[PDB]
């Protein structure tokens, strides 16, 4: 008989899932697993990405359970948990979403190993990118295209991605009976005060396949907006309504398939012949996931800077207090702390806001090295991707990919544009909420008068700016010109 596990790791949905269709065909027992260290806080992850985890391992536990199955949580490491139940549960196949993060193909390969001394077929179908990245790199001539431009060339040339693939059967083969690894209590879904966390989550956004099918449909509720979608248009200053899709979580971890998000763009394309084009439409901001998980997978050391080809080599100065400034939300800009403060309660900023955040930190005033705050966003943003945060920290520090280190976004008047009363200040800057639209910007040059019948002195209840923008920008721009020289 055929009895098979389905490993998850990213890819949590049932939804466009290759592996676990595989999984449960002519099977007899299928065991869901999901394998959870008990100790990654004793070696940098905020609750709010973990416990958004959590909740989409409790949502595919509520859609095994509503066909018959139980999701597995298996506590330990995958190279001493499955030589165990391999043998335990007679397992003949293990199958998985492929994955291509320098961790994963170092953990995947000791498997691999694993389940051949056990004689255990492995399956690793692709659908956590549109396409087999290394795929694309062979029709490119073996290279990686290193520009956006040539990549949406060669997908162009390459067709349409796969299709989603269909949904699993309404029944599914459920694990054995009295195998003691799978024993109820050893193998359920923690709480985040279970796995250590003092300080309860804040986020608004909800973890699951469920949550993320649902904001899915609400995106493509207005075909028009889709169509017409242009991303360097957007306001990074929406709160209530964010501008943009929030549908980077659900990427990240799987809950939502890429393949599907394409499938109904095309849908939507077909029928709106004025549709946005790559880079800046939907559709582009997919393909902009793609390229740099395609670079970034072949490229040595894509996370660092030293030993990085594609990395410029950039003399970052070590100035652990505008770090600790920048990171704790006391730079002084109201604009850069609002967003720093989204940053640790949401999880999430529009792209822009990680924009200004960033260029500030880098080659705009601070001259810190990217990867410090690069260090930052991987503990609190709940998207945190590897690929993805480490190339677009490049490209804002115009360390890769982008090298137009004269422009440089005013702390100060990039927001004004958006939101000249200041909305998205007062909502997470609440210090600052009775201050007049005319200094919410630029608190140090409201009269003192101003200061005091608004119950916020500058240098009492917020801080004074850190830095002038106009000195610190210029000395900025000087020394990244003698880099690029
Ligand atoms: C310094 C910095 C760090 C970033 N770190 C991350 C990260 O860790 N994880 C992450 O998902 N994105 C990261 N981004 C990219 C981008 O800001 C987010 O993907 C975007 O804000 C997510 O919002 P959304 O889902 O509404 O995007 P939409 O505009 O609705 O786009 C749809 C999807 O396309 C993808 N996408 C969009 N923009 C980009 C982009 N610039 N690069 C790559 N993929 C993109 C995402 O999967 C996103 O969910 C970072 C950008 C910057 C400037
Ligand atoms: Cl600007």
Known sequence: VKNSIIWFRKGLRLHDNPALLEACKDAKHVYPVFVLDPHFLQQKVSVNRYNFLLESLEDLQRSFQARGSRLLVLRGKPEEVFPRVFREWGVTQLCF?????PYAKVRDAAVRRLAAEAGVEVVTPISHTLYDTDMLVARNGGAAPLTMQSFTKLVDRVGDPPAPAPDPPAAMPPP????????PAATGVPTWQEVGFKEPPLTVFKGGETEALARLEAAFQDPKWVAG????????????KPATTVLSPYLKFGCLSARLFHARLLEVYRRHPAHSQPPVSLRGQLLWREFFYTVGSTTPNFHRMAGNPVCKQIDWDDNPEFLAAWREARTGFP???????????????????????????????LYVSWERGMEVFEEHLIDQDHYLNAANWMWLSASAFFSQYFRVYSPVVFGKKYDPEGRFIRKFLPVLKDMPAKYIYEPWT???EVQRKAGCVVGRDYPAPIVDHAVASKACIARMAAAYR
């Open 97 to 101: 979403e492929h994955d291509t993060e």
């Open 176 to 183: 054995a009976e009295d195998m003691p690894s799978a024993a």
């Open 229 to 240: 979608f242009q991303k360097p248009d957007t306001d990074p200053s929406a709160w209530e």
């Open 335 to 365: 604009w850069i702390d609002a967003i720093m403060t989204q940053l640790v309660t949401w999880g999430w900023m529009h792209h822009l806001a990680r924009h200004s955040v960033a260029c500030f930190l880098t080659r705009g005033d």
């Open 446 to 448: 409201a009269p003192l």
